[PDB]
Structure formats: C-alpha cells, structure tokens
Amino acid sequence: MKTQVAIIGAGPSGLLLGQLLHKAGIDNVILERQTPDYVLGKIRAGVLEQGMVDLLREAGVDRRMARDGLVHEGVEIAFAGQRRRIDLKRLSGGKTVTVYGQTEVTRDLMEAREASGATTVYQAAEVRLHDLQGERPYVTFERDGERLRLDCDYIAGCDGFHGISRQSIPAERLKVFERVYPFGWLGLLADTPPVSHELIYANHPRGFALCSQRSATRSRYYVQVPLTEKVEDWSDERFWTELKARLPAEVAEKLVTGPSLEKSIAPLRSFVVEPMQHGRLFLAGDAAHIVPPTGAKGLNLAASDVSTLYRLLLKAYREGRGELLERYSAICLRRIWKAERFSWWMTSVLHRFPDTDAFSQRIQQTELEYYLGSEAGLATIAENYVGLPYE
Amino acid sequence: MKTQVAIIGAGPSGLLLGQLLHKAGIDNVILERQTPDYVLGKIRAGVLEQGMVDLLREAGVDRRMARDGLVHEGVEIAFAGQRRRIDLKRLSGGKTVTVYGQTEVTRDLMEAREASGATTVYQAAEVRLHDLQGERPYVTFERDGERLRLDCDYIAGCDGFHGISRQSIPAERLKVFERVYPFGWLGLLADTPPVSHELIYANHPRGFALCSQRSATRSRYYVQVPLTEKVEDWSDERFWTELKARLPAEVAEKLVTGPSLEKSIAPLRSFVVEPMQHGRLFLAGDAAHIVPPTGAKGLNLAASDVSTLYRLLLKAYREGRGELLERYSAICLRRIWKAERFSWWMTSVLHRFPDTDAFSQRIQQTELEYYLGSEAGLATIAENYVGLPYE
Numbered sequence A, B: 001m002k003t004q005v006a007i008i009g010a011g012p013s014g015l016l017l018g019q020l021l022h023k024a025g026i027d028n029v030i031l032e033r034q035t036p037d038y039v040l041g042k043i044r045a046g047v048l049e050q051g052m053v054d055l056l057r058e059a060g061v062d063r064r065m066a067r068d069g070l071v072h073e074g075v076e077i078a079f080a081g082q083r084r085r086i087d088l089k090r091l092s093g094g095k096t097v098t099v100y101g102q103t104e105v106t107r108d109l110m111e112a113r114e115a116s117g118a119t120t121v122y123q124a125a126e127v128r129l130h131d132l133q134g135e136r137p138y139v140t141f142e143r144d145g146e147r148l149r150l151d152c153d154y155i156a157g158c159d160g161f162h163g164i165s166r167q168s169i170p171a172e173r174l175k176v177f178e179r180v181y182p183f184g185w186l187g188l189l190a191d192t193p194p195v196s197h198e199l200i201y202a203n204h205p206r207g208f209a210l211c212s213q214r215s216a217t218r219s220r221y222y223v224q225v226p227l228t229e230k231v232e233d234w235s236d237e238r239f240w241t242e243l244k245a246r247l248p249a250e251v252a253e254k255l256v257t258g259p260s261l262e263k264s265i266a267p268l269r270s271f272v273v274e275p276m277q278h279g280r281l282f283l284a285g286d287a288a289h290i291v292p293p294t295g296a297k298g299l300n301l302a303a304s305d306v307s308t309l310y311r312l313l314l315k316a317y318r319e320g321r322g323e324l325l326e327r328y329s330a331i332c333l334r335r336i337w338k339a340e341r342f343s344w345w346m347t348s349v350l351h352r353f354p355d356t357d358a359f360s361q362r363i364q365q366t367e368l369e370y371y372l373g374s375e376a377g378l379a380t381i382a383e384n385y386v387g388l389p390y391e
C-alpha cells in the first residue's frame, strides 16, 4: 500500500493531524498499536486552550464540544488559608479555556474519521520505520501475522512518550532535556457534581490537591503522592479523607463524594528533545515532549505542533514548497520551551517537595503572595494559562 | 549617660534612622565600632529606589544627591547574543531608580549629623546590650579603656550582618532562612567613563557580568567568580580581559578601561530572620536580612525598615502609642520576603550555576526570553526593580 502521509499513533495528535490533512485533500493512513477501546479508556486531559478549540472547529469536529464543553473565565489558587481567583478573561485580554475531556475529544475525532472513510489500522503490531532520509521512506507492520509495507512521502510520529518514532532517530542526533519530579498525581474520576464552577489548585502542607471536572455531574480530583505509592493502597474512602484534609474548610464541607469510576497515579516529568524531526520523520505531541500536568499544557502543545506540521505539509503539497518543512522544529520549540517553563513554575509553587529548607518554603509562599497580589503578576499567570499565541 | 533611642552601627541604616529621629525631636546616640574613615572606605551600593530617594529628602539630606545623582529610566539585560532594554519608567507606571554611591550617601549623612550636634561615638568597643525585655534597657561599651553605660528606652540594631544585635537575641527565639550561593562578585571601581548610560546585566556562558557606574567619569564593573578565587589573582588586566569576553562585541569595543581604584570579592547569600525584634531591641538593615546584590535591594530594604521603625517610634513618643511597635516585624517582613524573592529570581536567571543539566540551562534561557519578550513579563521585572510600595 501507499499513501502520502503515514501517521503513527491514533491518540488525539494523530487523529487531529489526520482529520486536518484529510479535509485538505492530503491522504494519510493512521497506524495504531492498540484497539479503539484501549485508546478510549484513557481519562487524561480536561483543560483545552482556545487555540485547540479553534483547531477542532477548523477540522470540523466541534459540534459536541461546543455543546458539552464548559467555558471557564477564571481559576482559583488556594494557599496559606486564602483562596485567590485569577480572572483569566480579564487579565489575558478576553481569552478563556474550555473544559472538555480528552476522552470526548478522541471519541469525536474517531467518529469523524470513521465517517470520512480515511484509513486507520488498529492493532498494527511491530511498527518499524525505514529510509527516513530517503525520498521514499516506508513503514512495515504486522496485521494478522502478515507483515505489510506502507510507502509514503512523510511520516508523522504521533505515538506518545514510548512510541517507536523517537526511538527510530539515531540517538546521537537528538539532545534530550529531562527532569523527573519526586512525586506523582493520584487522580479520581467520580460521577458527582464538582465542588466548584471553576478549578481549584491547592498548595497545602500535606501536599498539592486539585479540584477539576468534566461536566455538571462529573468531577476529577487529584492529590500529590510519593512515587512509592500504589493505587491499590488508596481506597475511595482514603482518597476523600485526604482530599478534604488538603482543601479550605468551606470548600471541604460542600464536597459531594462518591464511588470512583477511575483511579490512577500519573508520575510527573518534564522532557524535551531537540530537534523534533529527522529527514522525512516529524515528531508531534508526547512523542517529542512531556510537561507536568500542573499547567494543563500537554494536549495543548500537541495541538500547536499538529497545527504547525499541517500548515507546513499544505504548503509542501499544495504549493510545492517542501523546503519549508525544515523549519518545523524551530517554530515548535519556541512555543514548547515557554509552556515547559510555565508548567515548571506552576509545579514548583504548588507542590510540596521533599527536603525543602525553611528559606525555600518561605520563598515558595512569597511567590504565591507576590504573583497573586500584583496586577502584573496575575497577568503573567493568566496569559500563560490561556495559552500563548501560535506562531 | 542616657538617651531615648540607642543606635548600634553608623552605616547608612543607623545614620538615616538617627537623622530622621533627630529631626523629629527624638534624641538618639549612635555607637560605631570602627572609625569614620573605615566606614567611608566601603564602595558597596550604587542603585537607589525612589522610596529611599524620598526618605533622604525627608531627612533633609538630598542636596548633593539631587545634584550628582543620575536618574535612570531603564536597564538592559544581555543574553544569547541579544540586548533587551527594560523601560522601567514606562512599565512601572512612571517610577525610576537613582544611581548615587553608598559612599556618597553615607558621607552626606555623616556631615548632616556632625552639623546637627547629635551624639555619635566612634571606636565604641565591646558593645553589649542589656535588659532587652526590661523597661530600662542599657548598652555598655569601652571608649579609651573605660567602660561606659548608656541608658535608653529603645535600641535599634543597625550593625550589619556581623553585628552584636542579632547575636543578643536568644537564639531559640529566632528562625533563620538562609541560602548561600556557590559564587561571588569580583568588583572593580575605575576612574573611567561608563560603557553605557544605563546598566547592563549580562548572562554569558563564562558567567555573569555587570556594567554599572557612579558618575560620568567613574564606573563600577563586576564579574561572577567561584568562591575559591583570591582578589590578588586578578590583575586589572585579567579583569578587563575577562569582562570583555562576557559582553556583547559592540559593547566590549566601546569600553574604556583603566587602573582600578578598588577591587574586591563579595560572596552572594540570601538571609532572613523572623522576627526582627526582641523586647526593646529592633533589628534594621543587614542586621536582619541579606539579599544577593543582583536585584539592588539591600540598602533599599534597610531604608524601608528604617522608615517603618522611625514612623512607629514617632507614634510611641509623640502620641504615646507604644503598642504599635509590636507590629514592626510583620510590616517589614512582608516587603522583605518580596524583595528576597525578586533578588533570588534575578540571581537565578543571570548567573552560571555549577553542575546545571541541559534541561535547567534551557529553562534559564527560556525564562529570559519569555520575561523580556512579554509585556506582562517585562512589567513584573520593572515594578520589582523600581521597588514595591512602602506599607
């Protein structure tokens, strides 16, 4: 078989890129290692930037989102017995964020692809990439025990952190910047009304806590936990008791608890690779970089990488301007480093780090007080939170 | 002898407090361990906030400053082959900073005190503080081999980092927050015209560099050096060669060099003590806290502590409102922690730290790019640099 753009991974990055390209008349094939169900089992993201919201509209897959998504104009940070609200809308110049689960976004895209008739091969095992520097790269894989070959012009590695893509670039050609945090986030999804109409990020001595949501009758809560914790050691009961202990009393008493639909621990890490391409292979999303979930930037950076790659592929095909693709990494890396810096800051001011001296704790507290009390400080948080402009 | 307020230390803090009190009719005696000449030998500070400029005017010692001081409306940060200017005046709402050497400020105050006739005892050896929690505290010292006793109502510890004041409070009553940096600043004073009309803070791979000034024909330059360095290992020639290597080429070629009038290494450190008082003893300036020189906040925090103490002593004496003094530490600590956070940030983004991984270096560079390229980022630097409002 042959196609124009081969896409590895049917997560949100691959599906979004695939939908935009298909709509523009550029044929693409998506190869996914798992089943549709496995992909749909991941909860993950809840917060979307305006840029991603507009990109979903452009790919023509925003109906259900426009209907069920919740537009948020502010967020709240609780620390030292205070609850400060950041008016995102006012401080960012009118921008807001949208709460719509990653599971929903993925399901919408999967249905849009299914209807369009574009090629998607699930359970594509043993994917291997070949002749990345040639004019005719190709992908081989196994489906039903038989190894097939797929010829293409370009390959988009949208296979996440553990994908085959990044591993296929000669190690010596990439420079990795990584930071692993000494804690993870224990998340819990419950079919209960959220405790607030807006999100609440809490810095508490016992550790970080976050009150989020998916809809009016579905909530998503998180609490910082050491990397040594096992999810099986956290009953719903223990989770609720601990969450309550980390929130403002008035917030804790309004909390409606209930049995979990999902519970899991996500370890935190920062990771960037430079460059993000090699010959005819272009990395996008988690395949290229990881941000701690604190700043809600992961899926959002995937969106901007995808928007950038899509627009460069359009010029290559439609206008024969293939040279432009050389600029992919430079363009993406500028936005990536700024979102990484913001996610890093958010993570450092809201979490409890092991072995912190008295001076560091006071500075951490002072960072919150300064930034949440200054009009200029608030603006730096808001403009970064809503998402910096696409280049 | 007896007085109302006993002041330990004739550096800028003690002299400024002493002048303000004297003008308000409150008698004070200053005890200084060294000679007038020793005090006048210290170069130190060059940058003054507007608040300090106004306080000098209020104490009636601003003639020479208004005449010889240089008002600066912007500063520049050079990094990665770029030179970004921060318009302090525009971004802070019209505020600016004044360049006027600490040596000059001290000399002006010393002359003002001399003329007024207020008591100053130089070479006051073996100063000891007594009955800090009593109603009648007293200070003993040796002058010409004879131990004298000075009775007073209050004691202002304005004796710097190594003063006797902070050491006289029961250790168990204080909580210390401290951070010592792995580098120091090698400074050089030269009788040459500065390389720029504004200051230039430079982040360079070889390490930090700073181009400052005292007047139109006097400059003050600094370069970051390891704590193992000895000033005797740095000839004027070696200093100039190293400075040039750390500056933008166009800046390095306009540099007029010359023999040093002064050369010394100042190690960097952050230090805060809570509370800042004990009974009838109140700590002010370096006696209570130290900030790295990067943010130009040290002398400026001394000024706000002094303004706060002075205004509270006025209410105590003039209006019999002595209870107000209890609030000294709370008021000062709010401003101190914010200036400490800013000096810490400035220090972390402009210096080369030993053993920094690739990720940290990229984040450091990204911090500069984000903050110097965002209107909101620039504002956070400017409002903090000009100095946050006095409470």
Ligand SMILES: Cc1cc2nc3c(=O)[nH]c(=O)nc-3n(C[C@H](O)[C@H](O)[C@H](O)COP(=O)(O)OP(=O)(O)OC[C@H]3O[C@@H](n4cnc5c(N)ncnc54)[C@H](O)[C@@H]3O)c2cc1C
Residues within 6 Å of the ligand: A008, A009, A010, A011, A012, A013, A014, A031, A032, A033, A034, A039, A044, A045, A046, A047, A048, A102, A124, A127, A158, A159, A160, A161, A162, A163, A164, A185, A187, A266, A284, A285, A286, A287, A293, A296, A297, A298, A299, A300, A301, A302
């Ligand atoms: C707890 C948590 C909360 C988060 N919250 C937010 C939020 O609020 N906002 C935000 O922006 N981000 C958030 N994120 C991050 C966001 O979920 C990820 O950035 C996003 O899933 C990345 O999408 P992707 O398509 O790049 O990769 P993925 O979702 O990882 O999908 C990659 C796909 O490629 C497939 N694949 C892997 N190996 C191969 C192979 N060899 N061959 C074929 N297929 C392969 C995988 O099966 C997978 O289906 C959060 C993440 C977590 C963990």
Ligand SMILES: Cc1cc2nc3c(=O)[nH]c(=O)nc-3n(C[C@H](O)[C@H](O)[C@H](O)COP(=O)(O)OP(=O)(O)OC[C@H]3O[C@@H](n4cnc5c(N)ncnc54)[C@H](O)[C@@H]3O)c2cc1C
Residues within 6 Å of the ligand: B008, B009, B010, B011, B012, B013, B014, B031, B032, B033, B034, B039, B044, B045, B046, B047, B048, B102, B124, B127, B158, B159, B160, B161, B162, B163, B164, B185, B187, B266, B284, B285, B286, B287, B293, B296, B297, B298, B299, B300, B301, B302
């Ligand atoms: C290289 C460098 C650059 C700087 N640049 C700036 C700048 O641009 N802007 C800014 O705001 N800050 C800056 N600072 C800091 C500023 O110089 C200090 O914060 C300031 O000197 C503090 O004044 P002080 O009066 O509290 O203490 P000090 O200047 O330390 O004076 C205390 C006095 O008390 C005396 N004393 C000590 N022990 C006793 C005792 N037992 N009995 C009696 N007397 C005693 C000492 O002899 C001394 O005279 C800089 C500092 C350095 C080192």
